[PDB]
Design a protein around this ligand. Structure first.
Ligand SMILES: [Mg+2]
Ligand SMILES: [Mg+2]
Lengths: 405, 405
């Protein structure tokens, strides 16, 4: 047998940020919510805060955009680099530059699972099993998979064991599922605009929105509702049944992430055939074990928030063992390379960054160079035939380096 | 009827930090683990990372001290101030100065619960239901109660409904239960030094440690083991049974926080009469509802990490409704003013900050001025008869202000 391919050790790990409270508002990039004005993503979307007068109209108003984008780049001894982006910004930089770097630098580019376990174990006392800290860990994990793939000379999806489908089909998230159908997507997930404090009126309004789109889009085009942790079991139940006549495919994240018991009850009260989903805000494999056992149909971890690709692959296995499906939240290429290899992820999500959901603005525009976008609502595997996650970092953005070591 | 007392509005909220990766290592204060060398609290304590040779001997080596102390001060328009400290440091300052301030400033000093709900709601998307972000929220909540109490001119314990006992009795956490007994404490909790990877030898060594202290302390002085999230169900079960002959009162935090199912199984497997506890790393009332339902005997939230006093009071009610006890983790005065009013908190914890557990070094030395300490292992209620939480900020410490607004 021939000697194996030689691998360089990791020399440096650096972190930068754009957008957020300490940079330029509306920088976009990794933080899906760091947008400008008049964006659908900030137009009266129901949240745990919309019950408050001052925070009902805009999520930006309560600070859904304060973190911004975290960018993590790992440089190997041979000068090759790998990178990834997520939501964490400046604080994420502190965590990477002042803590996690000790487990990263000096390791082989292939020591990905090891670095991952050490990051999880070393931050367990302050990570809260999700959120900001987990987004940061996820970003490092992704940058490591990117570097490894680029060093080896292969797309992440091939390293994982190959594609199980020639193309990825997408459903689009935004306020215009009708426009989305035009573009070739297989469905449209709309956000709810009213919550529990609005009562029966709120239910009629969002349900009427679903009815209208069903009329506009036809019966074969999927329709879903994203509730962004804004409801309670009773309201979610009433909304689900009110939308049942229009064949709503699923009702997503009705409750805050900790309310597992509530998800179990909501799922059992759901209209026959209608799915209940959640997961984008959960983190760590164990949390998904608890979520999976509530009986919900589909878990939706965000690859950059759940713990990274390493964790995502484990969650997929968890779901498959129960004969269920896993459909990641956004994530662009970080999801593509993963889900294209999952037999239990028959479709993916494309979150409209376009202010009016009329064009195919890239998922992480503009931080990612050469970022692929659905063509006729799909991305063929050949589009991913590039090293690592196949993209480069847009240094034209005004990246900031708040910390160093 | 007389006119109610005049209450000022909150004008400014400010955040500072000491210690941590960006300041002086070993600053102490809010971060119990930000200590110097030769400290019992860093002496081969078992952790989720001690299975790694490089991180077995010292928790500081894996970064248990990177955060340091967060200090939050709220100033009212009548120039009075209220403050609190916690573990979060520089990042905590970012969250307070760049996000939470919008919900704090302009409110009445009595709008504590309102500000609390808004902080939880606006950070739900990145808080992870615990850890760093929750620690920050908790610090703000405590600063608000401190200010409200100082404005009203009453100790927090009286505002809460009065003391239900004349004195708080403490058990001491550290390597010297024997010295703790001489000091007047009612019990001594020791940290385990070995983990699952150590197998039967590990169990024998820590069980021998307990046996030794049982011989030195007598049968009525309580003995407990703290496992700091370092085990799995099987190892914890074996250790518990190995210590049963010495009447170990309880075995604490054997598992990482997300492992509720494991806690349920561990409690079921525990020796008759021996208690299983956890909770210091959990956050939000909902997580405690889930934790409570696993059947563990005592939940141990840290007032500065669980969500604050506002949240601690709710957890106490939750436990009380189940006929169970709540014994907070450390917290000094922030716990004292609350627990002295809880019928179901018969005793409290004093975590040794003295390097060798031989003296009564203040719980949060040296950030808190006039910080009370147990006398004969107790703190009489009269010691708490000062406004708010009864202490002042030690400005002699080199406080840093990384952000402003
Ligand atoms: Mg969603
Ligand atoms: Mg403990």
């Amino acid at each position: 047998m021939e000697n194996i391919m030689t691998l360089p050790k990791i020399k440096h790990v650096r972190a930068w940020f754009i957008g957020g409270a300490t940079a330029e508002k509306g920088a976009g990039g990794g933080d899906y919510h760091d947008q400008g004005g008049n964006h659908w993503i900030d137009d009266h979307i129901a949240t745990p805060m919309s019950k408050y007068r001052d925070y009902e109209q805009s999520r930006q108003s309560f600070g859904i955009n304060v973190l911004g984008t975290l960018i993590v780049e790992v440089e190997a001894e041979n000068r090759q680099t790998g990178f990834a982006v997520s939501t964490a910004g400046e604080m994420g930089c502190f965590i990477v530059e002042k803590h996690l770097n000790r487990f990263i630098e000096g390791k082989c580019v292939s020591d990905i699972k090891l670095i991952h376990d050490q990051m999880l174990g070393a931050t367990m006392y302050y990570s809260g099993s999700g959120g900001l800290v987990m987004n940061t860990i996820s970003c490092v994990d992704l940058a490591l998979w990117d570097l490894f793939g680029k060093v080896v000379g292969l797309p992440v999806y091939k390293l994982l064991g190959g594609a199980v489908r020639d193309e990825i089909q997408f459903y689009a998230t935004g306020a215009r599922p009708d426009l989305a159908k035009e573009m070739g997507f297989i469905g449209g997930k709309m956000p709810t605009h009213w919550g529990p404090h609005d009562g029966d009126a709120g239910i009629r309004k969002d349900a009427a929105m679903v009815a209208d789109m069903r009329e506009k889009c036809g019966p074969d085009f999927w329709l879903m509702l994203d509730c962004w942790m804004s409801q309670d079991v009773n309201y979610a139940t009433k909304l689900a049944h009110a939308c049942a006549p229009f064949n709503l495919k699923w009702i997503e994240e009705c409750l805050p992430p900790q309310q597992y018991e509530g998800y179990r009850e909501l799922k059992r009260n759901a209209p026959a055939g209608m799915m209940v989903t959640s997961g984008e805000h959960h983190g760590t494999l164990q949390s998904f074990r608890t979520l999976a056992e509530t009986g919900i149909d589909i878990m939706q971890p965000d690859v950059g928030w759940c713990g990274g690709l390493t964790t995502l692959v484990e969650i997929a296995a968890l779901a498959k063992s129960r004969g269920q499906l896993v459909v990641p939240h956004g994530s662009s290429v970080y999801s593509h390379h993963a889900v294209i290899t999952f037999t239990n992820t028959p479709f993916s999500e494309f979150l409209m960054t376009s202010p009016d959901c009329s064009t195919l603005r890239p998922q992480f525009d503009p931080i990612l160079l050469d970022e692929p976008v659905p063509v006729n609502g799909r991305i063929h595997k050949s589009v991913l035939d590039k090293p690592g996650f196949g993209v480069e970092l847009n240094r034209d953005c005004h990246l900031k380096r708040p910390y160093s070591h």
